[PDB]
Scaffold this active site. Sequence first.
Site, PDB file in Angstrom:
ATOM      1  CG  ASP A 181      -2.333  -0.607   0.959  1.00  7.47           C
ATOM      2  OD1 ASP A 181      -2.618  -1.077  -0.088  1.00  7.47           O
ATOM      3  OD2 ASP A 181      -3.172  -0.596   1.842  1.00  7.47           O
ATOM      4  CB  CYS A 215      -1.320   1.623 -11.371  1.00  8.49           C
ATOM      5  SG  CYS A 215      -0.508   3.129 -12.086  1.00  8.49           S
ATOM      6  CB  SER A 216      -4.497   4.494  -8.975  1.00  2.00           C
ATOM      7  OG  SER A 216      -5.564   5.279  -8.670  1.00  2.00           O
ATOM      8  CB  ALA A 217      -2.675   8.167 -11.611  1.00  5.22           C
ATOM      9  N   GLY A 218      -2.260   5.521 -13.684  1.00  4.30           N
ATOM     10  CA  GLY A 218      -1.624   5.097 -14.922  1.00  4.30           C
ATOM     11  C   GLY A 218      -0.294   5.784 -15.225  1.00  4.30           C
ATOM     12  CB  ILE A 219       1.675   8.363 -14.286  1.00  2.00           C
ATOM     13  CG1 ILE A 219       1.207   8.818 -12.907  1.00  2.00           C
ATOM     14  CG2 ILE A 219       0.749   8.918 -15.384  1.00  2.00           C
ATOM     15  CD1 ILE A 219       1.185  10.372 -12.725  1.00  2.00           C
ATOM     16  N   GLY A 220       2.528   5.833 -12.267  1.00  4.91           N
ATOM     17  CA  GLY A 220       3.550   5.444 -11.308  1.00  4.91           C
ATOM     18  C   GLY A 220       4.032   4.000 -11.425  1.00  4.91           C
ATOM     19  NE  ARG A 221       1.304   0.535  -6.832  1.00  2.00           N
ATOM     20  CZ  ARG A 221       0.356   0.176  -6.035  1.00  2.00           C
ATOM     21  NH1 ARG A 221      -0.430  -0.769  -6.407  1.00  2.00           N
ATOM     22  NH2 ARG A 221       0.212   0.738  -4.864  1.00  2.00           N
ATOM     23  CB  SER A 222       1.358   2.276 -15.339  1.00  2.00           C
ATOM     24  OG  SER A 222       0.105   1.691 -14.960  1.00  2.00           O
ATOM     25  CD  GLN A 262       2.076   8.574  -9.025  1.00  2.00           C
ATOM     26  OE1 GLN A 262       1.828   7.433  -8.962  1.00  2.00           O
ATOM     27  NE2 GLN A 262       1.251   9.450  -8.695  1.00  2.00           N
TER      28      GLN A 262
END
Length: 283
Positions: A181, A215-222, A262
């Site tokens: 998390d 992912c959530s925003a599509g920029i960090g993990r993605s 991020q």
Amino acid sequence: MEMEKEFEQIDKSGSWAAIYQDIRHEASDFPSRVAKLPKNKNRNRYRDVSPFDHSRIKLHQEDNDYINASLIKMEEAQRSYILTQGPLPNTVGHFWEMVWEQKSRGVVMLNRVMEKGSLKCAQYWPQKEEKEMIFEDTNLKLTLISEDIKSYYTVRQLELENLTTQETREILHFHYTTWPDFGVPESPASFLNFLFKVRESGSLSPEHGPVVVHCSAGIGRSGTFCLADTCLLLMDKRKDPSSVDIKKVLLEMRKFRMGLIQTADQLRFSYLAVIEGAKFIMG
Ligand SMILES: CN(C)c1ccncc1
């Protein structure tokens, strides 16, 4: 500079949270006018994360063609990815028209539906074989065919059918379920394993359309997922594998979607996963 030695002429001091800094200043900035139109406000998860006009993925529904999704195209590597935000309750339909329209074979999901006590994205696929999903004003049907739960991830076989032509297609869902998390994974081994499953599926191949990653925003993990994959492919390809420059790759990818990577910690984790995977790619 051997990127492992720059992993220690940074962790040494700890200018991680300053390298990431130069990345933000030097990154590209293009217009996102379609995304900012008032009629698309409800189509965006966050107001500070938008796709660029030049690389956005357009939908065939002439009425409104907007989805929060970008095409990342890497010339040297011969690789293409669609990075998108996790679907909203009202864009579930739009997510599947995209997948269909583009001929993609795999969907890659890097988060859990619920994290930190809040929702990261809508439940966009069926949890049970005998309970299939339908999408309002969309003409599609999606069915769960099978599912394979493992320790750090799950792989699902899905069927998507055009109801107007009765055409059916196989979509594979690659879901990494254990990203913590907060922070990043201590070890990059399970993430590397995941990547390699996606590669093995043949989803990243030119016969099909680009993989869809979110992912959530599509920029960090993605962004971690694509940067790594490209950087490892590049190692296979060059004569001298130590010439690969990751900021350089990462800066190239940010021409196509803003904000990829991020935090400082994510950057680190990326350098950490590539260095590790490079030990294999040389088997
Ligand atoms: C735009 N946004 C955050 C949402 C839209 C519709 N339902 C929930 C959220």
